[PDB]
Design an enzyme around this catalytic site. Structure first.
Site, PDB file in Angstrom:
ATOM      1  CD  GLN A 167      -3.096   0.779   2.253  1.00 64.95           C
ATOM      2  OE1 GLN A 167      -3.033  -0.130   3.072  1.00 64.95           O
ATOM      3  NE2 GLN A 167      -3.876   1.832   2.423  1.00 64.95           N
ATOM      4  CG  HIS A 186      -1.512   4.270  -1.799  1.00 65.39           C
ATOM      5  ND1 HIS A 186      -2.643   4.692  -1.128  1.00 65.39           N
ATOM      6  CD2 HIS A 186      -1.831   3.081  -2.369  1.00 65.39           C
ATOM      7  CE1 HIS A 186      -3.593   3.782  -1.258  1.00 65.39           C
ATOM      8  NE2 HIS A 186      -3.125   2.794  -2.006  1.00 65.39           N
ATOM      9  CG  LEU A 239      -2.271  -6.091 -12.001  1.00 67.03           C
ATOM     10  CD1 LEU A 239      -1.647  -6.377 -13.353  1.00 67.03           C
ATOM     11  CD2 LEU A 239      -1.187  -5.643 -11.027  1.00 67.03           C
ATOM     12  CE1 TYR A 240       2.080  -2.815  -7.983  1.00 65.86           C
ATOM     13  CE2 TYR A 240       1.156  -3.780  -6.009  1.00 65.86           C
ATOM     14  CZ  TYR A 240       2.256  -3.474  -6.788  1.00 65.86           C
ATOM     15  OH  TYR A 240       3.525  -3.852  -6.327  1.00 65.86           O
ATOM     16  CG  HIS A 259      -8.321  -3.414  -1.432  1.00 63.85           C
ATOM     17  ND1 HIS A 259      -8.243  -3.226  -2.798  1.00 63.85           N
ATOM     18  CD2 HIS A 259      -8.064  -2.211  -0.868  1.00 63.85           C
ATOM     19  CE1 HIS A 259      -7.974  -1.955  -3.046  1.00 63.85           C
ATOM     20  NE2 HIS A 259      -7.859  -1.319  -1.892  1.00 63.85           N
ATOM     21  N   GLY A 261       1.228  -8.329 -14.104  1.00 60.75           N
ATOM     22  CA  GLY A 261       1.688  -7.367 -13.112  1.00 60.75           C
ATOM     23  C   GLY A 261       3.145  -7.041 -13.305  1.00 60.75           C
ATOM     24  CB  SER A 276       5.952  -5.112 -11.225  1.00 60.36           C
ATOM     25  OG  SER A 276       6.780  -5.236 -10.081  1.00 60.36           O
TER      26      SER A 276
HETATM   27  C1  HEM Z   1      -7.380  -1.458   5.612  1.00 62.19           C
HETATM   28  C2  HEM Z   1      -6.588  -0.994   4.635  1.00 62.19           C
HETATM   29  C3  HEM Z   1      -7.148  -0.486   3.282  1.00 62.19           C
HETATM   30  C4  HEM Z   1      -8.182   0.340   3.125  1.00 62.19           C
HETATM   31  C5  HEM Z   1      -9.046   0.967   4.232  1.00 62.19           C
HETATM   32  C6  HEM Z   1      -8.359   0.560   1.718  1.00 62.19           C
HETATM   33  C7  HEM Z   1      -9.331   1.331   1.176  1.00 62.19           C
HETATM   34  C8  HEM Z   1      -9.184   1.966  -0.016  1.00 62.19           C
HETATM   35  C9  HEM Z   1      -9.861   3.185  -0.445  1.00 62.19           C
HETATM   36  C10 HEM Z   1     -10.907   3.975   0.398  1.00 62.19           C
HETATM   37  C11 HEM Z   1      -9.410   3.462  -1.673  1.00 62.19           C
HETATM   38  C12 HEM Z   1      -9.798   4.645  -2.602  1.00 62.19           C
HETATM   39  C13 HEM Z   1     -10.867   4.261  -3.637  1.00 62.19           C
HETATM   40  C14 HEM Z   1     -11.509   5.539  -4.159  1.00 62.19           C
HETATM   41  O1  HEM Z   1     -10.776   6.383  -4.780  1.00 62.19           O
HETATM   42  O2  HEM Z   1     -12.748   5.725  -3.937  1.00 62.19           O
HETATM   43  C15 HEM Z   1      -8.454   2.432  -2.009  1.00 62.19           C
HETATM   44  C16 HEM Z   1      -7.788   2.394  -3.192  1.00 62.19           C
HETATM   45  C17 HEM Z   1      -6.677   1.683  -3.499  1.00 62.19           C
HETATM   46  N1  HEM Z   1      -6.097   0.664  -2.744  1.00 62.19           N
HETATM   47 FE1  HEM Z   1      -6.751   0.256  -0.775  1.00 62.19          FE
HETATM   48  N2  HEM Z   1      -7.408  -0.135   1.023  1.00 62.19           N
HETATM   49  C18 HEM Z   1      -6.635  -0.802   1.958  1.00 62.19           C
HETATM   50  C19 HEM Z   1      -5.570  -1.635   1.670  1.00 62.19           C
HETATM   51  C20 HEM Z   1      -4.891  -1.727   0.463  1.00 62.19           C
HETATM   52  C21 HEM Z   1      -3.769  -2.605   0.151  1.00 62.19           C
HETATM   53  C22 HEM Z   1      -3.120  -3.637   1.113  1.00 62.19           C
HETATM   54  C23 HEM Z   1      -3.407  -2.349  -1.117  1.00 62.19           C
HETATM   55  C24 HEM Z   1      -2.288  -2.998  -1.947  1.00 62.19           C
HETATM   56  C25 HEM Z   1      -1.292  -2.217  -2.358  1.00 62.19           C
HETATM   57  C26 HEM Z   1      -4.275  -1.334  -1.643  1.00 62.19           C
HETATM   58  C27 HEM Z   1      -4.184  -0.833  -2.911  1.00 62.19           C
HETATM   59  C28 HEM Z   1      -4.971   0.171  -3.393  1.00 62.19           C
HETATM   60  C29 HEM Z   1      -4.771   0.889  -4.641  1.00 62.19           C
HETATM   61  C30 HEM Z   1      -3.664   0.700  -5.690  1.00 62.19           C
HETATM   62  C31 HEM Z   1      -5.932   1.899  -4.713  1.00 62.19           C
HETATM   63  C32 HEM Z   1      -6.225   2.947  -5.815  1.00 62.19           C
HETATM   64  C33 HEM Z   1      -5.486   4.237  -5.469  1.00 62.19           C
HETATM   65  C34 HEM Z   1      -5.686   5.298  -6.518  1.00 62.19           C
HETATM   66  O3  HEM Z   1      -6.304   4.977  -7.568  1.00 62.19           O
HETATM   67  O4  HEM Z   1      -5.231   6.463  -6.309  1.00 62.19           O
HETATM   68  N3  HEM Z   1      -5.177  -0.973  -0.659  1.00 62.19           N
HETATM   69  N4  HEM Z   1      -8.333   1.529  -0.977  1.00 62.19           N
HETATM   70  C1  LIG Z   2      10.164 -11.410 -10.682  1.00 66.33           C
HETATM   71  S1  LIG Z   2       8.902 -10.607 -11.638  1.00 66.33           S
HETATM   72  O1  LIG Z   2       8.535 -11.386 -12.864  1.00 66.33           O
HETATM   73  O2  LIG Z   2       9.412  -9.283 -12.105  1.00 66.33           O
HETATM   74  N1  LIG Z   2       7.566 -10.398 -10.724  1.00 66.33           N
HETATM   75  C2  LIG Z   2       6.916 -11.396 -10.133  1.00 66.33           C
HETATM   76  C3  LIG Z   2       7.078 -12.719 -10.536  1.00 66.33           C
HETATM   77  C4  LIG Z   2       6.390 -13.752  -9.911  1.00 66.33           C
HETATM   78  C5  LIG Z   2       5.510 -13.472  -8.871  1.00 66.33           C
HETATM   79  N2  LIG Z   2       4.863 -14.489  -8.268  1.00 66.33           N
HETATM   80  O3  LIG Z   2       3.839 -14.257  -7.310  1.00 66.33           O
HETATM   81  O4  LIG Z   2       5.217 -15.859  -8.532  1.00 66.33           O
HETATM   82  C6  LIG Z   2       5.341 -12.138  -8.462  1.00 66.33           C
HETATM   83  C7  LIG Z   2       6.029 -11.095  -9.106  1.00 66.33           C
HETATM   84  O5  LIG Z   2       5.902  -9.780  -8.720  1.00 66.33           O
HETATM   85  C8  LIG Z   2       4.860  -8.970  -9.070  1.00 66.33           C
HETATM   86  C9  LIG Z   2       3.742  -9.416  -9.779  1.00 66.33           C
HETATM   87  C10 LIG Z   2       2.706  -8.532 -10.111  1.00 66.33           C
HETATM   88  C11 LIG Z   2       2.782  -7.195  -9.730  1.00 66.33           C
HETATM   89  C12 LIG Z   2       3.889  -6.746  -9.013  1.00 66.33           C
HETATM   90  C13 LIG Z   2       4.925  -7.628  -8.688  1.00 66.33           C
END
Ligand code: HEM
Ligand SMILES: CS(=O)(=O)Nc1ccc([N+](=O)[O-])cc1Oc1ccccc1
Ligand SMILES: *[C@@H]1O[C@H](CO)[C@@H](O[C@@H]2O[C@H](CO)[C@@H](O[C@@H]3O[C@H](CO[C@@H]4O[C@H](CO[C@@H]5O[C@H](CO)[C@@H](O)[C@H](O)[C@@H]5O)[C@@H](O)[C@H](O)[C@@H]4O)[C@@H](O)[C@H](O)[C@@H]3O)[C@H](O)[C@H]2NC(C)=O)[C@H](O)[C@H]1NC(C)=O
Ligand code: HEM
Ligand SMILES: *[C@@H]1O[C@H](CO)[C@@H](O[C@@H]2O[C@H](CO)[C@@H](O)[C@H](O)[C@H]2NC(C)=O)[C@H](O)[C@H]1NC(C)=O
Ligand SMILES: *[C@@H]1O[C@H](CO)[C@@H](O[C@@H]2O[C@H](CO)[C@@H](O)[C@H](O)[C@H]2NC(C)=O)[C@H](O)[C@H]1NC(C)=O
Ligand SMILES: *[C@@H]1O[C@H](CO)[C@@H](O[C@@H]2O[C@H](CO)[C@@H](O)[C@H](O)[C@H]2NC(C)=O)[C@H](O)[C@H]1NC(C)=O
Ligand SMILES: CS(=O)(=O)Nc1ccc([N+](=O)[O-])cc1Oc1ccccc1
Ligand SMILES: CCCCCCCCO[C@@H]1O[C@H](CO)[C@@H](O)[C@H](O)[C@H]1O
Ligand SMILES: CCCCCCCCO[C@@H]1O[C@H](CO)[C@@H](O)[C@H](O)[C@H]1O
Ligand SMILES: *[C@@H]1O[C@H](CO)[C@@H](O)[C@H](O)[C@H]1NC(C)=O
Ligand SMILES: *[C@@H]1O[C@H](CO)[C@@H](O)[C@H](O)[C@H]1NC(C)=O
Lengths: 553, 553
Positions: free
Chosen positions: B172, B176, B353-354, B357, B495, B499
Site C-alpha cells: 500500500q 500509493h 491490477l494492484y 485488498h 503485473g 512492476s
Molecule cells: C485497511 C486498509 C485499506 C483500506 C481501508 C483501503 C481502502 C481503499 C480506499 C478507500 C481506496 C480509494 C478508492 C476511491 O478512490 O474511492 C483504495 C484504493 C486503493 N487501494 Fe486500498 N485499502 C486498503 C488496503 C490496500 C492494500 C493492502 C493495497 C495494496 C497495495 C491497496 C491498494 C490500493 C490501490 C492501488 C488503490 C487505488 C489508489 C488510486 O487509484 O489512487 N489498498 N483503498
Molecule cells: C520477478 S517478476 O517477474 O518481475 N515479478 C513477479 C514474478 C512472480 C511473482 N509471483 O507471485 O510468482 C510475483 C512477481 O511480482 C509482481 C507481480 C505482479 C505485480 C507486481 C509484482
C-alpha cells in the site's frame, strides 16, 4: 579555503565533488579514464583517441572530393555514416538531463521539473576568486563594449555558403518553439515545456490556448480568409495572449502559437505556412477516415507536422548549414541499432549558441522595395499585402549575414548579444575552453589561436587577461572560420550534438511511434517521409516562387 | 455499419485502424506478423514461438528444484537470467507510452500530458454492440453482486506463501506514490506526476508541499518528539493538506508526503520509518560534505532513499511475491547494454491490477490485543501508543490474506473492489481475454477453464454469457492459482511487466545517474547497494524487533 572544484580538476567528464573542508574527488565512472582527475586512459580509450582524426580533418573530408561522395551517397555507406553521425554526436549529451540553474549536481527536482533548462557543464561556483573560476581579471569585460568592438557590424558580410533569409527566418521560427525563457521566473527557466519539436509555436505551449486556436471542426485550426488567401485568425476571433504593442488592434493582431510571432512578418509568414499545412493535412486525412471525430484528426495532423518538420530540418536545413556532400537522411530506423533516449531537455548552452542574429541583413528587399528595420519590425500588413508566394520569393533571394568571424550584427539588434553575455554571467556559464574540452576539442592556448589574427586577439587578450577566461558566447562568434563557411568549428561541434539530440530524441522517432498507424496510415506516413521546403510551400499556395534555404545563382 | 474494431480482429499488438465508412486494416509493423489480421509469422517469430515454453513451465522452473538454483545463484548465470527476466518483462510495456482515457491512438497530448494514466490496451470503442466488445450480454453483471457472491471473504484464507501485514502495508505505502487518482478530474487522471518511484509519498507530489515538510536546515524533513521518539511533524508545524476526520485536534494530525497516509497506522508507520531514514542519511552526508548546503543535502538524500526503495522492492518485496529460487537482484548495470528507455508512465491497468485488498485480515493483532477495523481505521494515537518497533513486530507476525483464489476480501473494505469494476467500465477496459493476448498468453475458452473448479465458474457462465465478456479485475481475482501461489498466473504475468518497468524505468537506474557522485560518494552508493527492510527499520529504532515480509517458522 579556496574551492578546489573551482580549478575544474576533473577532466573527461569526471564529476568534481567536495569532501570535508578543502579536499575534492573526481568520479571517473564510465569516463574511459581513472586517477584522481580522470586522466589515466583505459586500454580501449587510449586506443580510441590516437586512432581518432581531429574534427577539422573529418570536416575537410565531408566537404571535399565529390567523386568519392557521388559513390558513397548512392550506396548503403550513406546510412552507415548517417548512423555514425547520429549516435556519436548525440552521445555527447546527457539524457536523462543532469543540472539546472539551481542544481550543480544530479537531483530529482532537476530531473522532474520541466520549467528548468538543463546544462552540460555545472555553473561556475559562487565561492570563487574570479567569476570565470580561477582565471582572468576580478570584474569581467564590459558586455556593451564587447558587442561594439567585436560583434557590431561595420559593413555587411553575406554568408559565404549562400544561405538566404528564407533559412534565417526558418531558424528563428523553428527554434522559438523550444527556446522561450520565462519572463516571470527569470533566467534559466522556460515556457516551452515540450522541450523540442512539439510544434508549440503553432498550437501554443498550453492546452487551454491550444483549444482557443482550434476550430474544433474537422481537426482544423481557426483561420481568416483575406484577398482569397488563408491566414491565422485575429485575436478577436481567437483570443490568446499575443505580444503586439499596445493600441494595436486585437482586430489586426494575428493569433498563432508563439506569442512573439506577431512582431516580425518573417515569423508570421511561417506561422501562416504551417497553419495552411495543418489544415491541408486535415483535408487529406478526412478522405480516408470519415468515421474519425474531430480530436483524432487534430492530433494526427500534429504528428505529421512534427514529422514533416524533422524531415526538412534534417535533410535540408542542416544540409545547407553543413555543406556536406554526404546527403543527410531522416530515418529513425537507423537508430533502432543502439542505446538511445527518445527524450530531450533544452540546455541553456543551446539557447546561448542559437542566438544567430548575425544572419539578419542591413535591410529587407522585396523585389523593388527596400524596407528598413523600423519599416519591417512590427509591420501589421506587409504579410497580407504581398501574400506568401511573394514573401517566399523575396526571403529565398536575399543573402543572410555570415554568423562566425565577428563584426556582422546589425545595430538594431546588437542589444540581444549584450544581454546573452550578461545572461551568460548570471547563469555562471563555464568558460568557452571548458566547453571545448567537453565537446571533444582541445582548449585554445591563446587568443591568436582563437581568432587566427592579431588585432582582435591581442585586444581581447588584454580585456580578458587569459584565454581560459574567454566566455562561451563571445567565443563562439569570434573564432575564425574556414573561408566558404558560415561559422566556426566550435559552433558545429557544440551545436550539432544539441541539434541532433533535439531532432531524433523526439518520441515519434521511437520503435513505438514510427509506424504508419501513428500518422493515420500510409498517406500520413508517406507525407512525413517525402516532405520538403518546396512542397511545404508550393502545396499550400496558388503559385510557386523560388523556395530554398539558399539564394539562387 | 458496426465498427470493425469492436472485434479486436488484430493479434499480437497490431493496430486496428478504421478506414473509409465500414472497412478497417491493421498496422502490423514490427509485430513479427504479416497479413490483414496478423497471424502469418515471420521465419524468426515461428521458431521463437514453436520453441517458447509456457508461463506454467517457467513458473515451475523457478519455483522447483533448489540444488540447481543454489548452484545457479553462485555463478554468472544469476546475472544472465536476471537480465533475461527484466528485458523479457519490460519489453511488453510501450515506451514512449501510447494511449490514455481520452485518446485511443498515439498523439502528442498523450505523450505530453502526464496528468493522465496511460493504457496498454485501448478502450472498448464507444460505438460497439456489447459493453465489452461483441461477445456477451447487454448488461455487465451488477458490480456489488459480483463482489458479494465472488469476492466477499467468508472465512479468512491466509496467504499460502507466508505473507504478512508488514508486506501488505509496505505494498500500500509504496504503491500509493504512483496511484493518486483524481477525485476531481475523475477516473483515469493522476495527481502523482512522478509516475514512478520518486518518493512523492514521502516528500509530497508538489514543490509547495515539499518545502512545507522540509526543515530547510541540514537537508532534513521536520519532525516531533513524542516519548523520546522521532515521528512526523504536526500540521501546525508543517501546515500541509492531510485527510483527517474533521473534529480531530490539530496537534494530533501528522503531516506527510501523501494525503491519505494519516488514516491508517500501517501507512503512518512507514512514513515514519522512511522519514527517520531520510534525516539519518543527511547525518551521514553532512559528515562527508560539511560544505554542502541543505538543498544539496536534501536532494542527495532523496536519491539515496529512492535507490534504497528499489533495492528493497526488487530484492525483498518482489522476491517474496515470486517464491522464486532465483535470488532477485538490483543491479542497474544489467541493462547497460540494451535498448532500454529510462522512463515510465503509469497505466490504469496497473492501478486496477494492484488492488490487493484481499491482503487485509479480519482484525489486527498487536501483542495480547486484537484490534477490529472500527478500532484500527483512523486511529491517530496508536502509532504513538505502541511505537515503531512494537508495531513492525506485530505486522511481521500476523499473516496476510491470499490475494487470488476468490472470496478473500473482508466485508469492511469490500466497497473498494465494487468501485474498481465500476471504474473499469468508465475506463472501457477491454475483456480479460484481450489482456491475456496482449501479455503473450492463450485466452480462456470456458469459465470452467478459468477457475478450474466446476461450481463458481458456471454461475459466471450465466451472469456473463460468454468468456470474452469476462472483466479485467474479476478475471484476475477469480483465476485459478498455481500450486500454492498468492495469486494466479495472470496477475503474475500481467503485473510484473508493469512492476519491473516501474522500478528500472527510473532515471536513477540510467547510465547517466548510476555513479557514486549522484549519492555524494561511496557512502551513499553503498546504502543503496546494501539496504534491507531489516536495516531500514532497525538502524532507526532503539531495539531491533522481528521484521520481515514473511511470518516466522
Ligand atoms: C485497511 C486498509 C485499506 C483500506 C481501508 C483501503 C481502502 C481503499 C480506499 C478507500 C481506496 C480509494 C478508492 C476511491 O478512490 O474511492 C483504495 C484504493 C486503493 N487501494 Fe486500498 N485499502 C486498503 C488496503 C490496500 C492494500 C493492502 C493495497 C495494496 C497495495 C491497496 C491498494 C490500493 C490501490 C492501488 C488503490 C487505488 C489508489 C488510486 O487509484 O489512487 N489498498 N483503498
Ligand atoms: C520477478 S517478476 O517477474 O518481475 N515479478 C513477479 C514474478 C512472480 C511473482 N509471483 O507471485 O510468482 C510475483 C512477481 O511480482 C509482481 C507481480 C505482479 C505485480 C507486481 C509484482
Ligand atoms: C491534461 O489534460 C487535461 C484533460 O484535457 C487538462 O485539463 C482540462 O483542460 C481543459 C482546458 O480547456 C478543460 O477543457 C474543458 O473544455 C470545455 C469545452 O467547452 C468549450 O468552452 C469554450 C469556452 O470559451 C468561451 O468562449 C470564448 C471564445 O470561444 C473563450 O475565449 C472564453 O474563455 C469563453 O469561456 C468554448 O469556446 C468552446 O466552444 C466550448 O464550448 C470548457 O467549457 C470547460 O470549461 C473546460 O475548459 C478540461 O475540463 C480540463 N480538465 C479536465 C479534467 O477535463 C489539463 O489541463 C492537461 N494538463 C496540462 C498540463 O496541459
Ligand atoms: C530582426 C530579427 C530578429 C529580432 C527582432 C530578434 C529579436 C529578439 C529578441 C528581442 C530576443 C529576446 C532577447 C532579449 O530581450 O534579451 C531574442 C531572443 C532570441 N533570438 Fe532573436 N531576433 C531576431 C533574429 C533571430 C534569428 C534569425 C534567430 C535564429 C537563429 C534568433 C534566435 C534567437 C534565440 C534562440 C533567442 C532566445 C529566446 C528566448 O530564450 O526567449 N533571433 N530575439
Ligand atoms: C520548478 O522549480 C521552480 C524553482 O524552484 C519552482 O518555482 C518557485 O517555487 C517556489 C515555491 O513554490 C516560489 O517561492 C518561487 O517564487 C517559484 N518561482 C521561482 C522563479 O523560483 C516551480 O514551481 C517548479 N515547477 C513545478 C512544476 O513544480
Ligand atoms: C508595412 O509594409 C507595407 C508594404 O507591405 C508598407 O506600405 C508600403 O510602402 C511602400 C514604400 O515603402 C509603398 O511602395 C507601398 O505603396 C506601400 N503599400 C501599402 C499597402 O501602403 C507600410 O508602410 C509598412 N508599415 C510600416 C509601419 O512602415
Ligand atoms: C480476419 O478477421 C476477420 C474479423 O474477425 C474475420 O472475418 C470474418 O470472417 C467470417 C468467417 O469466419 C465472415 O463470415 C465475416 O464476414 C468476417 N467478420 C468480420 C467482422 O470481418 C476473418 O475470419 C479473419 N481472417 C483470418 C484469416 O484470420
Ligand atoms: C550533420 S550534423 O553534424 O548533425 N550538424 C551539422 C554539421 C555541420 C554544420 N555546419 O554548419 O558545417 C552544421 C550542423 O548542424 C548544426 C546545427 C545547429 C548548430 C550547430 C550545428
Ligand atoms: C590520425 C588522424 C590523421 C588526420 C590528421 C588530422 C589533422 C589534420 O588537420 C586537418 O587537415 C586538413 C588537411 O586537408 C586541413 O584542411 C584541415 O583544416 C586540418 O584541420
Ligand atoms: C567521413 C566520416 C563521417 C562519419 C563520422 C561521423 C562523425 C560525426 O562527427 C563527429 O562527431 C563527434 C561528436 O561531435 C566529434 O567529436 C567528431 O570530431 C565529429 O566529426
Ligand atoms: C589533478 O588536478 C589538480 C587540480 O587541477 C592538481 O592540483 C593535481 O596536481 C592533479 N593531480 C594529478 C595526479 O595529476
Ligand atoms: C486506538 O488505539 C489505542 C491503543 O492501541 C486504544 O486503546 C484506543 O481505544 C484506540 N482508539 C479507537 C478509536 O479504537
Amino acid at each position: 579555503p579556496v574551492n578546489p572544484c573551482c580549478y575544474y580538476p576533473c577532466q573527461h567528464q569526471g564529476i568534481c565533488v567536495r569532501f570535508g573542508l578543502d579536499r575534492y574527488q573526481c568520479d571517473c565512472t564510465r569516463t574511459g579514464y581513472s586517477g584522481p582527475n580522470c586522466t589515466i586512459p583505459e586500454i580501449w580509450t587510449w586506443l580510441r583517441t590516437t586512432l581518432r582524426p581531429s574534427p577539422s580533418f573529418i570536416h575537410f573530408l565531408l566537404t571535399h572530393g565529390r567523386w568519392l561522395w557521388d559513390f558513397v551517397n548512392a550506396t548503403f555507406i550513406r546510412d552507415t555514416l548517417m548512423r555514425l553521425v547520429l549516435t556519436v554526436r548525440s552521445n555527447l549529451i546527457p539524457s536523462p538531463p543532469t543540472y539546472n540553474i539551481a542544481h550543480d549536481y544530479i537531483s530529482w527536482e532537476s530531473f522532474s521539473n520541466v520549467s528548468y533548462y538543463t546544462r552540460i557543464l555545472p555553473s561556475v561556483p559562487r565561492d570563487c576568486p574570479t567569476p570565470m573560476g580561477t582565471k582572468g581579471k576580478k570584474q569581467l569585460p564590459d558586455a556593451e563594449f564587447l558587442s561594439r568592438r567585436f560583434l557590431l557590424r561595420r559593413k555587411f558580410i553575406p554568408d559565404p555558403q549562400g544561405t538566404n533569409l528564407m533559412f534565417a527566418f526558418f531558424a528563428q521560427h523553428f527554434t522559438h518553439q523550444f527556446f522561450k525563457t520565462s519572463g516571470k521566473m527569470g533566467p534559466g527557466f522556460t515556457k516551452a515545456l515540450g522541450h523540442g519539436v512539439d510544434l508549440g509555436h503553432i498550437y501554443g505551449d498550453n492546452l487551454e490556448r491550444q483549444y482557443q486556436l482550434r476550430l474544433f471542426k474537422d481537426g482544423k485550426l481557426k483561420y481568416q480568409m483575406l484577398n482569397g488567401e488563408v491566414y491565422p485568425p485575429s485575436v478577436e476571433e481567437a483570443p490568446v495572449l499575443m505580444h503586439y504593442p499596445r493600441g494595436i488592434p486585437p482586430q489586426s493582431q494575428m493569433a498563432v502559437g508563439q506569442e512573439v510571432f506577431g512582431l516580425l512578418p518573417g515569423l508570421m509568414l511561417y506561422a501562416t505556412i504551417w497553419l495552411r499545412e495543418h489544415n491541408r493535412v486535415c483535408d487529406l486525412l478526412k478522405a480516408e477516415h470519415p468515421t474519425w471525430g474531430d480530436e483524432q484528426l487534430f492530433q494526427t495532423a500534429r504528428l505529421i507536422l512534427i514529422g514533416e518538420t524533422i524531415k526538412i530540418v534534417i535533410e535540408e536545413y542542416v544540409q545547407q548549414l553543413s555543406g556536406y556532400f554526404l546527403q543527410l537522411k531522416f530515418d529513425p530506423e537507423l537508430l533502432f541499432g543502439a542505446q538511445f533516449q527518445y527524450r530531450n531537455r533544452i540546455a541553456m548552452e543551446f539557447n546561448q549558441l542559437y542566438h544567430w542574429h548575425p544572419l539578419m541583413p542591413d535591410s529587407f528587399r522585396v523585389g523593388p522595395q527596400d524596407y528598413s528595420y523600423e519599416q519591417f519590425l512590427f509591420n501589421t500588413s506587409m504579410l497580407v499585402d504581398y501574400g506568401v508566394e511573394a514573401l517566399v520569393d523575396a526571403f529565398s533571394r536575399q543573402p543572410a549575414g555570415r554568423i562566425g568571424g565577428g563584426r556582422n550584427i546589425d545595430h538594431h539588434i546588437l542589444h540581444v548579444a549584450v544581454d546573452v553575455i550578461k545572461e551568460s554571467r548570471v547563469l555562471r556559464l563555464q568558460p568557452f575552453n571548458e566547453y571545448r574540452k567537453r565537446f571533444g576539442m582541445k582548449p585554445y592556448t591563446s587568443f591568436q589561436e582563437l581568432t587566427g589574427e592579431k588585432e582582435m586577439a591581442a585586444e581581447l587578450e588584454e580585456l580578458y587577461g587569459d584565454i581560459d577566461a574567454l566566455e562561451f558566447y563571445p567565443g563562439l562568434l569570434l573564432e575564425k572560420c574556414h573561408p566558404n563557411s558560415i561559422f566556426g568549428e566550435s559552433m558545429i561541434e557544440m551545436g550539432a550534438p544539441f541539434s541532433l539530440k533535439g531532432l531524433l530524441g523526439n518520441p515519434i522517432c521511437s520503435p513505438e511511434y514510427w509506424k504508419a498507424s501513428t500518422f493515420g496510415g500510409e498517406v500520413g506516413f508517406n507525407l512525413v517521409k517525402t516532405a520538403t521546403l518546396k512542397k511545404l510551400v508550393c502545396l499550400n499556395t496558388k503559385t510557386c516562387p523560388y523556395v530554398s534555404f539558399h539564394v539562387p545563382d
